[PDB]
């Protein structure tokens, strides 16, 4: 039994899980938010108590010390010296990573060189790494890329029919992202039906907030619909997801737009808060819409038909389909999603069992269906976790 | 019988045919240049070298005088080409007054192509105002797509007062090479679930369900969709504010990328035209080899989107100036599609037969030549001279 702590830190937060490996059992989980500002606040949970504290949080720096205080203050750990590896979340490997790498000082450089890609993300990403290797100096620890699972793909599904110039020279490409989440639900898959994933062709569903769709066959990666940037694919919470390219320069001439304008329009003002006009969030506009708001309804409509298209294009891609998988937030818990997406699709001999989709059971296709259909609690953590085994204990 | 003219109307030019209708028959057909004038006939040809109000002139002069029509009033009517009837033309139109002012109103749209199209519909009045003008707009035919079909995930502002939406474009040729289609099987179009491969300089993708566009592949713009000949079609939105901030680009900048530099032209660094890429690969270029593997794939997975859409495919057509000849093209957009009883008969594609699919295979694959001018006809005898 070894104990494994992954961490996710963001421009103002720490997410942390600890975890008994390889059995992959929670110890305690929680969340360090609003670093640096007022209203900071600490959330610690175990399997059987909760405590919340707000509190000033400095810097990361701070946010590290009260985590690790906090693991024997609270009798979760006798003492530190029982961590024995820690996994690192990082936004954007590029073209550089194609698995999780063991953190040393070059795998750091590396991670920072990458932040003109993932600006927002990657060097605060590298900064937890920094102060996890300060504060436990001893602890292995494993930066796990959620690219890197994409790397799979061929040129001819990274490659933007853009001049080459932008690929050569501006490293303009698709990278895909919800790496960690396609490739733990995948291996799950494929353990729950007994099978090497090598032997089915998947499409893997991973709709949250955001919301991506990926192509595996092969074991690999082979499409993704998340691109250059976590905008784009099909449409998410605030996100449009993929529009016409040309309404963008229309709308710097017509409306006189800046680039951040466009790239607040195309993050934050869209998907479903832009076209229910209620909320982001999935079961509010079911809500609305389930009580006559038609453009909430029309919101639901267009967002499964954005996941159908992005599904269809990947298993003609395939030349076919074995399973399809769902997960995250919506398709975890959305049965009428579902239920939405996998309609009328018997040139697949893909149906739904209506009594196990209700009940989000762990497949849910018809009786008599060809395709299986998984319901698959996604677990990054838990990904991250095996991650840090595979590479820093080997034993 | 009738004698139809159909009209295209270039920034820069001024395409007509003349058929016999409805036979189908061409009487005369023929192009003006550099606004160099040409007039082919069954058995004739005529050259020459020499504003758009001149080439009406002459154009008209040349049928009274090449002796293809012994008077101008042996016209019975005249089609003209729009390019954008946005949401108000779901069908051709009957160019009565009005429908000019509205055409016009639209060029906000189509800035380029629709005041000149509205300039010769004028011209054609003044010139020959005895005989009756229909409009045949290129978006009409797909005014039947749902909003799940043409609605951005935008801020629902965009669409309600700017306008924002998928139109589609091609409209004319996805309809005329759908209902050819039908006429060859002896079935109606509505039995049918068909994918239509609109694949010239300008490529576009459009799904035919019961009688009735469902979905294309061009959006707002025609700049959209699959990988054309020098345009983009469809890339990730963000890479474009990515490219103001890092490289100071300018709007009409990022339309001239994504219109003109990019495409087969910007992957192969070759040229746009897919026969020059074709044997830049064959000699061993790599970018043009590439150049014509993306472009096989992005109409690939336009194609699997809209048979999702459709629950099934019944047959797949190929069009256009590349669907037509390149048998490379088709085989390569064709290539490992048995989960859909879809394969190609390597004999037929090779000599592009109107038929392509394997014998054993579910799917109707088909090589159709587009003719818009006579889809045109049809709607100027629908709308003109309806006995």
Known sequence: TYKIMAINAGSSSLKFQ???????????????????????????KTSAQKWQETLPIADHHEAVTLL????????????????????????????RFKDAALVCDDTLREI????????????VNALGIRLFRQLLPA?????????????????????????????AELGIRRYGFHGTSHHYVSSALAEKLGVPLSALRVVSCHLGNGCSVCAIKGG???????????????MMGTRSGDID?????????????????????????????????????????????????????????????RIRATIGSYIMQMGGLDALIFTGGIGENSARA????????HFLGLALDDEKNQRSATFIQADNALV????????????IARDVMRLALPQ
């Not at 993704?224 to 694919?233: C, H, L, V």
């Not at 607040?264 to 869209?270: F, I, K, R």
């Not at 579902?338 to 699709?345: E, G, P, T």
Request: net charge negative; proline share 6%.
């Open 139 to 167: 602890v292995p620890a494993v930066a796990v890329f959620d690219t890197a699972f994409h790397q799979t793909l061929a040129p001819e599904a990274w490659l933007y029919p853009l001049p080459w110039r932008y690929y």
């Open 245 to 305: 390219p040309s309404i963008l320069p229309w709308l710097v001439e017509k409306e006189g737009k800046s680039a951040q304008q466009l790239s607040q329009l195309l993050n934050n003002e869209s998907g479903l808060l832009g076209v229910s006009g209620v909320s982001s969030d999935y079961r509010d506009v079911e809500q609305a819409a389930d009580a006559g708001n038609e453009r909430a309804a029309l919101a639901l409509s267009l967002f499964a038909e």
């Open 220 to 234: 690999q990666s082979v499409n993704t619909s998340m691109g250059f940037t976590p905008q784009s694919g099909v």
């Open 68 to 95: 690790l205080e906090a693991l024997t203050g609270r009798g979760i750990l006798s003492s530190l010296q029982e961590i024995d590896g820690v996994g690192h979340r990082v936004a954007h490997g590029g073209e």
């Open 112 to 123: 920072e060189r990458l932040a003109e890609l993932a600006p927002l993300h990657n060097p």
């Open 18 to 44: 600890l975890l008994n490996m390889p059995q992959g059992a929670l110890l305690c989980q929680g969340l360090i938010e609003r670093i640096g500002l007022p209203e900071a606040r600490f959330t610690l």
């Open 338 to 345: 579902r239920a939405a997406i996998c309609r009328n699709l």
């Open 372 to 383: 299986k259909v998984a319901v698959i609690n996604t677990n990054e953590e838990l990904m």
